[PDB]
Amino acid sequence: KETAAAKFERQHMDSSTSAASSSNYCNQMMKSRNLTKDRCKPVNTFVHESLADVQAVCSQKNVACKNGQTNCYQSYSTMSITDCRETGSSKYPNCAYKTTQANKHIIVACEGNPYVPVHFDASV
Amino acid sequence: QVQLVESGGGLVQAGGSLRLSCAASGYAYTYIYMGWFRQAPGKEREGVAAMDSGGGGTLYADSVKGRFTISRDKGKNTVYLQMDSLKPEDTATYYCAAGGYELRDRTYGQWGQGTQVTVSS
Ligand SMILES: [Mg+2]
């Protein structure tokens, strides 16, 4: 079983680029991170920051999650992110995505020891 | 550095009462949930009581309902546990925790060093 901390890193971290490299970034990344294996994941966000800066968010401001849970944390700085949304003509197994770049505060839910992000909750 | 400073607890006779206290220092914001967990030797850590910073969302383990009472100073990072009618099975190390949700220990990221509570017979 992949851990929840490892799954967050696979689904949401891209420390290798400062921002989406092209309008095909999401098509490429949703495939290579295996987010289209048995269905098209309808939306996803990648964070273009170091793993240490995103893990640090779990020590920053404690806030409510989108669903009202209270183990969420909001980043002190805005972070570079890419939002991936499935296109209307996308049809598993042939998944297609629109790439949109943003720079926003991120909110993540954290768990565990070590206490790390296990869920990307929102950008604000 | 955040420090959760716990006080109180210790040795008491079965049937007796004790209070535990915990004040967080070093955190620049408000922890929405704080709580009390406990672990006996050899057993898994268990949530005892938790409360949110508005004085609501109060939750207790079934085995302490009616006997234990949690409280916080409204809007601040302090939490207290009054324990009455103590039983030998309440003997454990008790931990304050901050920053999680309800009684789910995996969600809490800041932990006190732990305070022994010993209930004798
Ligand atoms: Mg950057």
Domain range summary for chain A, segments of one domain joined by +: 1-124
* DSSP label at residue A41: -
Query: Are A71 and B33 in contact (CB < 8 Å)?
Result: yes
Chain B hits for A71, Cβ within 8 Å: 33, 99-101, 104, 107-109
Distances (CA, A) of A5 to A35, A84, B43, B77, B96: 16, 21, 25, 27, 24
Q: How many CB atoms lie within 10 A of CB A16?
A: 7
Query: Are A61 and B29 in contact (CB < 8 Å)?
Result: yes
A119 is catalytic: yes
Backbone angles phi, psi at A14, to 5 degrees: -135, 80
Radius of gyration of chain B (CA): 13
Cα A50 to Cα B11: distance, rounded to the nearest angstrom: 48
What strands lie across the sheet with B78-83, from one edge to the other? B3-8, B18-25, B78-83, B68-71
| Token digits of residue A67 | 């669903």
Given a contact cutoff of 8 angstroms between Cβ atoms, the answer to whether B112 and B93 are in contact is no
DSSP chain A: ---HHHHHHHHHB-TT-SS--STTHHHHHHHHTTTTSSS--SEEEEE-S-HHHHHHGGGSEEE--TTS-S-EEE-SS-EEEEEEEE-TT-BTTB--EEEEEEEE-EEEEEETTTTEEEEEEEE-
Given a contact cutoff of 8 angstroms between Cβ atoms, the answer to whether B89 and B39 are in contact is no
Ligand 1 centroid – CA B55 distance (Å): 40
Resolution (A): 1.8
Full domain range(s) for residue B83: 1-121
Backbone angles phi, psi at B104, to 5 degrees: -90, 100
> How many domains would you assign to chain B?
1
Cα B2 to Cα A84: distance, rounded to the nearest angstrom: 36
Burial degree of A50 (CB within 10 A; 0-12, 13-18, 19+)? exposed
A105 is catalytic: no
Closest CA to B20 of B121, B117, B119, B118: B117
DSSP, collapsed to helix, strand or coil, labels residue A44 as strand
CATH number of the CATH domain containing B115: 2.60.40.10
Backbone angles phi, psi at A19, to 5 degrees: -170, 170
Select the residue from B2, B3, B4, B29 to test the A interface by mutation, using most A Cβ atoms within 10 A. B29
Chain B hits for A109, Cβ within 8 Å: 107
Domain A1-124 CATH class label: alpha beta
